[PDB]
Structure 1
Amino acid sequence: VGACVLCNSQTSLRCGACIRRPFLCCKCCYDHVISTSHKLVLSVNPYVCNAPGCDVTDVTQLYLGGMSYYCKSHKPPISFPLCANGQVFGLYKNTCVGSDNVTDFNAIATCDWTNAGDYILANTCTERLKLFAAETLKATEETFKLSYGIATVREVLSDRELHLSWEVGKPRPPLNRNYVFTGYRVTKNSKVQIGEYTFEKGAVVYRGTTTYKLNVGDYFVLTSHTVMPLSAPTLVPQEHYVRITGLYPTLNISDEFSSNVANYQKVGMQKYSTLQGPPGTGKSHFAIGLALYYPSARIVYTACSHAAVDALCEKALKYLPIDKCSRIIPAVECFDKFKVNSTLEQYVFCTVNALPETTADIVVFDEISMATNYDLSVVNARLRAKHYVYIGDPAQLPAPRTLLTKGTLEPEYFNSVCRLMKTIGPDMFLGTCRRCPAEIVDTVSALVYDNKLKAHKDKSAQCFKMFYKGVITHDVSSAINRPQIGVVREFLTRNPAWRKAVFISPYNSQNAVASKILGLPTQTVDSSQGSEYDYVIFTQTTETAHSCNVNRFNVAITRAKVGILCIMSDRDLYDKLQFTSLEIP
């Protein structure tokens, strides 16, 4: 009993054949039932033929007879068509207004979220309709992830590797940390508690969360939670107040946030402001300087993942009084120096999956780009705060979309905060890239960033680019290029000092074999934010929409402060990037 999706008219009808079973008004529900294949409707009682042994599920074939709903041949002489006047029989009959344009929500309800146009629809349709787009999108792919095989261990070779069998009939999920498994110990009674691991090929190398010893026959699954419909839209309407209301300014300021103070002057005067968050310019410095500017306020340090809120926790250890801090994670290993589960404190450091229902002064949401409409709306469902602060940047990284197959989703339509960030522009940014040299910062300014990023110190003359062609070999969910592992083969010879230039890679298995040949550390391009190294080497290895993506690879380039290696096999970025180039050995 509530309001329908498009019309928001009070109703009592819920489409049975639909994904998430939403409320629909009589005319609105009928418009859905004829404009989709969703032929099931479910009111306070089920609309099926209640005569014994019937199978009809469509509503049109149903007719009312007495105290039930009857099919063609099961009816009594006294009957009445449930589907009449273009509005199916239901409670709140007259108080239905109908929707002129329903085909959008029919498309979302019939959507499989396969192509990019599905996401374009997911973000173009209206407010609760696009929240429902997020609901249905997620709901679909958690119904997807468990439709794969179960990782049943067969043998215990040694530490860090195992043998894996998979159930017949359903395929094997990709071999990365993208699909986080979770295990339980199979016993004579039931299965209980192993923990979250991710598997790659050795032999099956297992990356376990905690230390643990496994035996034969124990199997892990890709678990899902119970996804429950949100309340609030993606973000509240904008309102520009006259002055900083509800907040008391500071007395004096330190130098390291001056370029930040003349920033917080405006996020404090209205409620929200999207922040063009270029990588590593003092982003968590931006977050902590909010509290430095306003100490008494509650600042809500959150992120889509715990490893990102750990970044804001790091600068809480040095700049924030810990007497008034809070670390919130429910019963994973993280930064747990603050008091755990303290709701009514000033600084709350937590992840969207566990932020409790509270009210606070200002929020700082790290990494608005890795998040979808869902969590970026459940944060508003969590807090109706005075000021909202949006850390992150679409030119950094999105969440990995499993069902996105054909076409890429452009910077515009990752989520709602990505909308106004390049239509009305960002309200906000920091230009002091505390990381990059002039070799990289000028290159990335002329990339997507509106020719913005000014140089920090110098042209290091340590970042290298070299053109190649490469031949590609790919088997299951990866891609390995032997010759581009054969060019790093010889360049690390004449240098005794580039031993410590960590190997970055698009696909983890290629560098997993390279580290068997070479031994340099690993790095995932998809989740590279959080740590930056002075010296890193990298190979794109691919010209398709994985590594040649402008923002997916901008992060790999932008995390080096003096020197970086980028073996380019493409034409898309060679004429677009400019480092110092060497010949081919």
Structure 2
Amino acid sequence: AVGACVLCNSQTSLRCGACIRRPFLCCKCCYDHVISTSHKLVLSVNPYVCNAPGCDVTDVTQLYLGGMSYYCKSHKPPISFPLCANGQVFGLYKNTCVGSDNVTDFNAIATCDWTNAGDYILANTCTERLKLFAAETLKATEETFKLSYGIATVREVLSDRELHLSWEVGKPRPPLNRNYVFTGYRVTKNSKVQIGEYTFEKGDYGDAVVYRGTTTYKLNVGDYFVLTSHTVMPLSAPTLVPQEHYVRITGLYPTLNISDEFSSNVANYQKVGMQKYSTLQGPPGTGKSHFAIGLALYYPSARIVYTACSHAAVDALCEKALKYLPIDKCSRIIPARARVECFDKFKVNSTLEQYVFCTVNALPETTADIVVFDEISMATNYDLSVVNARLRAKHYVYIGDPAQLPAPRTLLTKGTLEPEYFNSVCRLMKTIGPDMFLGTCRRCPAEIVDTVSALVYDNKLKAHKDKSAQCFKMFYKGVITHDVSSAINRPQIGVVREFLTRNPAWRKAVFISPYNSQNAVASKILGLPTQTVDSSQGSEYDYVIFTQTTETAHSCNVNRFNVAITRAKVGILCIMSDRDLYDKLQFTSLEIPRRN
């Protein structure tokens, strides 16, 4: 049970059991972490407590090894050794470890609670191994916090799936979302017995709530539901394989003249094969995706794997691939999960096909020629190491836009992240240079392009295609019918009704919402299939509808707004109360009785 010092990679057998994640520490490093922190309990091949029954002095600095065993100050044998001695702590290979100076920031990491960007701002700039450990303890703290939510029980049954529930008084109630699952226990006297997994969702009124179940069990009244926790595996792969070069392209083989529509990018195609990996920054989904598939085409015999974090993202990508590829294609995507449905084409598990698509967390453990991560502007270094561990290939390509939407990383609530610090490759792009770049829109109406380039961009884009049928009724925000703090505004649909009918052909559009529950209620007084701004970022549409909640910080987020409005091809419309943005948007707003 030995290892390497998380700071010196020296041999040791210690773990600061007081620190959450139990990381290996060299001697000197351990001495310093313990001398400067409330962290005191050190674990070795055995725990370190006084073995005389009753003594619970667990501040290691007080303890003494006796004959073979450990002892307090009092119950110590006549002969012994003091453990915490001579600026070190006794452990295996004590006389070999080197020690170093990364202890300060180390304790800073181990002691923060991820509440202020500073501990982040350091999390993204420490050493790689340290970065790993940081991500580990971050996700662990997230999980532990998740436990803090309350418990739910049943109060009375209404239908097969209509029900009235009872919450814990004085406890945080988590939201109704497809990303939550509850183990159901009913108790006889005796017989606290699990009944199955059950998700939830708000019905048509309170507190009638729908639920999807694992089995057809009959419901009762002495039932209750616990949100099911989760574990977190430790990681060991670096975030970025050391960057390299070569003198000549290897591994991959171009064609000849096939598909000139992808012309200029061949230049990038060569240098991609010429490096170990590289990045590409591009405004929304323009050359992005387009270029990826083009390269894939370029080297035919090249086994290629696409992957991202957002399900809808990999879905839009796989359909764009279907648009041009032999089939001869699969998206080995989701086992017994897929609470939201996705791919419709091929298997989920053979790993024979050359062009395999999937989601990161559901990836196998396989090899390939190249691999193209996507939407790095949303992922965390955690996931990057995950993919570098599960997979192993020659040339990697990461793509995204540091002006898009990052990981929610809900835990932070004080300040804001500079995009530069979302994760490693984010820095890499923002720091030295994106190595390869693309600067033109092939997907969006020119007018919204003008608006955005006037905003978050520095007026640095161009494209084609202009009109029409665009507006920004600055319709005051009606009642925030917020079920949970997740926002809903029914009188916002109170004017969608006026475009639920006035719509001549705007009947096949997609609706987009800042919040999930206002999106669900849009599915209620239905107009069309809708989605969330996050679940966007991957597809374009001719018409798109947009209503907003209040001017809350989450709502008025410029980046969310940008990535939302940048999903349309010919028609668009967005409805905020809007004190300022409608001054920045360039359309033709109207008034409630003025809708043609």
**Unpaired stretches in structure 1, ≥5 consecutive residues:** none
Structure 1 pair 500–354 and aligned structure 2 pair: CA distance change class (3 A):
closer
Would the alpha carbon gap of residues 26 and 425 (structure 1) be closer, same or farther in structure 2, given more than 3 Å must change?
same
Shift of 1:104: 0.9
Note closer, same or farther for the CA distance 1:41–1:575 as it changes in structure 2 (3 Å cut).
farther
1:377 corresponds in structure 2 to 385
Q: Indicate the residue corresponding to 1:307 in structure 2.
A: 312
CA contact (8 A) 2:329 2:354 kept: yes
1:512 to 1:354, Cα distance in 2 relative to 1, 3 A = closer
Shift of 1:210: 11
Q: For residue 505 of structure 1, report the CA deviation from its aligned partner.
A: 1.8
Q: Matched residues, percent identical?
A: 100
Task: Measure how far apart 1:419 and its partner are.
Answer: 0.9
Name whichever of 212-221 and 337-346 sits farther off. 212-221
* 1:372–1:414 contact (8 Å) kept in structure 2: yes
Q: CA deviation at 1:167?
A: 4.4
The answer to which of 45-54 and 348-357 deviates more is: 348-357
C-alpha displacement of 1:118? 2.8
Q: In 2 relative to 1, CA 207–340 (structure 1 residues): closer, same or farther, beyond 3 Å?
A: closer
Answering whether residue 365 of structure 2 is matched by residue 357 of structure 1, we say yes
In the alignment, the residues of structure 2 paired with residue 404 and residue 386 of structure 1 have an alpha-carbon distance, to the nearest angstrom, of 36
SS of corresponding position for 2:530: coil
Deviations 1:376-428 (A, max 9, x none): 11111123321111133332222322312222222111111111112223233
- The answer to which of 551-560 and 395-404 deviates more is 395-404
Mapped to 1, the partners of 2:451 and 2:401 lie a distance apart of 17
Contact 1:182 1:194 in 2 (8 A): yes
Stretch deviating more after TM superposition (504-513 or 70-79): 504-513
Displacement, 1:234? 1.1
Indicate conservation of the 8 Å contact 2:312/2:536, yes or no: no
The offset of 1:452, in angstroms, is 3.5
Partner of 1:432, secondary structure, is coil
Give the alignment's TM-score, normalised by structure 2.
0.87
User: 1:367 Cα shift?
Assistant: 2.1
Gaps of 5+ in 2: 203-207
Distance 1:254 1:515, change over 3 A: closer
**Range 568-577 or range 108-117, more displaced:** 568-577
CA deviation map 1:551-573 (0-9, x unaligned): 22222111122222222334563
- d(CA) in 2 for partners of 1:129 and 1:432? 39
**Conserved? CA contact 2:522–2:530, under 8 Å:** no
Structure 1 residues 190 and 417, CA gap change in structure 2 (3 angstroms) = farther
Partners of 1:431 and 1:354 lie apart in 2 by 33
- 1:174 match: 175
- Taking the aligned partners of 2:131 and 2:444, their CA distance within structure 1 comes to 38
Stretch deviating more after TM superposition (223-232 or 409-418) = 223-232
CA distance in 1, matches of 2:508, 2:46: 67
- Give a deviation string over 1:30-68, Cα, whole Å, max 9, x none: 111122221111011111111112222211121222212
How far apart are the structure 2 equivalents of 1:366 and 1:212? 41
**Inter-partner Cα distance in structure 1 for 2:103 and 2:454:** 42
Question: Which region of structure 1 is more displaced relative to structure 2, 410-419 or 498-507?
Answer: 498-507
CA deviation vs aligned residue, 1:259-287 (integer Å, no higher than 9, x gap): 44333232221122222243332644333
SS of equivalent to 2:492:
helix
Secondary structure at the residue paired with 1:503? strand
Deviations 1:235-270 (A, max 9, x none): 112223333222222112213322443332322211
Aligned 8 A contact 1:123 1:413 in 2:
yes
Report deviation, 1:215. 6.7
TM-superposed deviation, 1:29: 0.6
2:24 is aligned with 1:16: no
8 A contact 1:442–1:455 mirrored in 2: no
* Aligned residue-pair number: 583
Name whichever of 48-57 and 431-440 sits farther off: 431-440
Give the Cα separation in 2 of the matches to 1:209 and 1:276: 43
Shift of 1:309: 2.5
Q: Determine if contact 1:49/1:56 at 8 Å carries over to the other structure.
A: yes
8 A Cα contact 1:148 1:171, kept in partner: yes
179-188 or 573-582: bigger deviation: 179-188
Query: Matched residues in 1 for 2:357 and 2:401: separation?
Result: 20
Per the alignment, do residues 456 and 491 of structure 1 end up closer, same or farther by CA in structure 2, a change over 3 Å counting?
Answer: same
Match of 1:546 in 2: 554
Contact 1:62 1:69 in 2 (8 A): yes
Equivalent positions of 1:106-117 (< 5 A) are: 106-117=107-118
